Symmetry: C2
Subunit: 166 residues, 2 copies
Amino acid sequence: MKVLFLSADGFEDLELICPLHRIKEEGHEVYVASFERGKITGKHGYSVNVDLAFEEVGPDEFDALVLPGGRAPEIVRLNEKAIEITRKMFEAGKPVASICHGPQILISAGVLKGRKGTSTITIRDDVVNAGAEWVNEEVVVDGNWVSSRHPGDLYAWMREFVKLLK
Amino acid sequence: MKVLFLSADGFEDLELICPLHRIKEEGHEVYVASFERGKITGKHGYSVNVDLAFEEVGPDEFDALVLPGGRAPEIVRLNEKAIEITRKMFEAGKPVASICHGPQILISAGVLKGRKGTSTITIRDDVVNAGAEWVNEEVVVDGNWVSSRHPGDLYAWMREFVKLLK
């Protein structure tokens, strides 16, 4: 599988880096995208290399999407390309995994009407106002959409997501 | 299985926390031991609860051992109780994973004579003087001992380690 992560500076470090390694473990290719190639820096000061700019991504290329949290989703969600990439991969029924603030991107993509998932509770209202049903669970699986709340949930988030790549 | 981590303040955050979730994912139990109960805090500011003191740990309790890196092993290596746990589990042939500065504990346990593995390169010489063969690779397996170097090696380190937990 080719697996795509969308992020930017201020990502929650664990929420990006642990899944990155978890997926490589399976021998999948992982690609990190952001505003531009280079490096991004997390809330806790870890860096990661960006493989692709949003501009250069063909949604079709990629088999699955990941949307980690932190502050990054607040600026990612303003990017038209990132929104398109997200809308397309999600409406195609490809596996999409979000955590924490990740769903801010899904909101801005307009894809949540009549879906069910979770998020950090601090944006619950905003998820509800996007027409999704919010629940408070460590992981939710709603067809292709696999969603968790915070870093404590990682093990369960990834337990369920890797199932979807098999 | 029950997996035991030995650590302290100054641990390299990823090297403790990602494997922690990795191993729960498989539905094993994970326990963190340090000098005393409470919380320890990583180099990059992540916090983890400590389940046990060293002086409460009985080696026979636990099925496998993990030794993350950072500044922590420099002080854990002085602790007789921690040494004795490590000596007993390693000589018993239980799976032992080490990364980065982790082997500082193995050195101090006197268990490395005739063994083969890797570490961060900054302590290569010290591993060699303890009587091991040092090689430079992203992961080595020497019987029950699975050793890596640094955080970029994570995916490989857990790939090979999880195998010994089956």
